[PDB]
Design a protein around this ligand. Sequence first.
Ligand SMILES: O=P(O)(O)OC[C@@H](O)CO
Ligand SMILES: O=P(O)(O)OC[C@@H](O)CO
Ligand SMILES: [Mg+2]
Ligand SMILES: [Mg+2]
Ligand SMILES: [Mg+2]
Ligand SMILES: [Mg+2]
Lengths: 241, 241
Amino acid sequence: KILTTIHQQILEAKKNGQKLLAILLDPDKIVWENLDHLLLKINQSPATHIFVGGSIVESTIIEDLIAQLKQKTRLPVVIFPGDPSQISPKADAILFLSLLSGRNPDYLIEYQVQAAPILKKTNLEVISTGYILIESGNETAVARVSKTEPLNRENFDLALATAQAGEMLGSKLIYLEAGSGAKKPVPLEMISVISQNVEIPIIVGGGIVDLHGIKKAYNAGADLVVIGTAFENDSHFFDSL
Amino acid sequence: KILTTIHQQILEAKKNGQKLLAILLDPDKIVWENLDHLLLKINQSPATHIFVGGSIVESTIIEDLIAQLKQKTRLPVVIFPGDPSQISPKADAILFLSLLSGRNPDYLIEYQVQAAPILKKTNLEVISTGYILIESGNETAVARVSKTEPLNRENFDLALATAQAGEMLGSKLIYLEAGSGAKKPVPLEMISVISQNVEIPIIVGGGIVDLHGIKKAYNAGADLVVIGTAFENDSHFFDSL
Ligand SMILES: O=P(O)(O)OC[C@@H](O)CO
Ligand SMILES: O=P(O)(O)OC[C@@H](O)CO
Ligand SMILES: [Mg+2]
Ligand SMILES: [Mg+2]
Ligand SMILES: [Mg+2]
Ligand SMILES: [Mg+2]
């Protein structure tokens, strides 16, 4: 590869039609006795990025995990934060999320204002990300912790308007999120509608439990797919015959 | 001049050290019998932009005013909106405000999501603007209508963090706002702290009642100053000997 910001890496990949893949590691769900093996499987996988976050956990545990990732893998490590406490200076970048599907100001601006001076004392690449929670069948942790409601999974116009408002406000990425372990993944037609009508790259995650689901999301217009649960449940998820 | 987006015009002006000046016309405060004279004075003034907004008013009245401005002046007309109803397709651009000093989600994302599909059926240039209300002595209309509180005028660190979070989220401009007819304008040291520690251009307005106040704001780091009240009160405000 070449030395680039992660933002430029994603933009170039989208322009060149090259699909990206992030494995999400949730530090609260990591069994450390098995982490060495897990990182070997990440290295062997087609993953292009490692995302870290997805649970409220003490900062030291996140820092410990990120230190292992930076030692034992060569992938960019992007923090996927729920709270400013999850900021770790050892990561490469941070998705600076705003929960655009929600109307809880803590997750629209308050935590971001708290985070800004913290991020200024790090070398993290900060990538504004419009985070849109899509209803998926059961209540997810994102909705629980944020005390917000997801966007109706059949209201394509609202999901689009939300992504477009994000883009207009200056989001550099849209992340369409069904939630960790979602029963129903983000609808493919929603991915298509949004990817055809915004210009910025689209991340899709939540509820994707087989390779076919990844391919379908890509085909529908996802530029980067996130897999957490399926790889947490099976370190061999990406194995081939 | 040359044909440019307003955003690029502001960026180039900042790079070249050329200070900009907007006259704000509030359509609810316009006496129409005197508008022809008022527009002549705008044309003779050093204004580079006309901003329109600053009161809750029916859309037809805004459209009527903007039509006159587009006919009788040559300045770019930028909508300075309080609600998606104030969008008029006849303007050149719109400051797509988010009220970063406040924690009312209507003014952080809700109205922006409502606005997005409306803006998509116009040719308006949409410029993400981090709108920061600074305490100024009395309650202003911005605080009243938004049901938010302004930022303490002595808390430079918070004002900075707010502007930095805006910048990180993708704001293209910061607008430091004391409110229309403010008793105390935005502090000069606040303008300096923010202009030295964010890279995007800074608009300052609210409470500026003489030319000296404009010069001081510019000297402190404002890239563009907005004057409403002082010109509404005296069409000859910008006259020279
Ligand atoms: O764990 P899963 O369901 O793959 O979802 C990943 C991610 O989008 C969750 O935040
Ligand atoms: O009317 P004045 O006090 O000049 O303020 C202008 C503008 O900043 C108000 O929104
Ligand atoms: Mg998934
Ligand atoms: Mg999964
Ligand atoms: Mg003023
Ligand atoms: Mg004035």
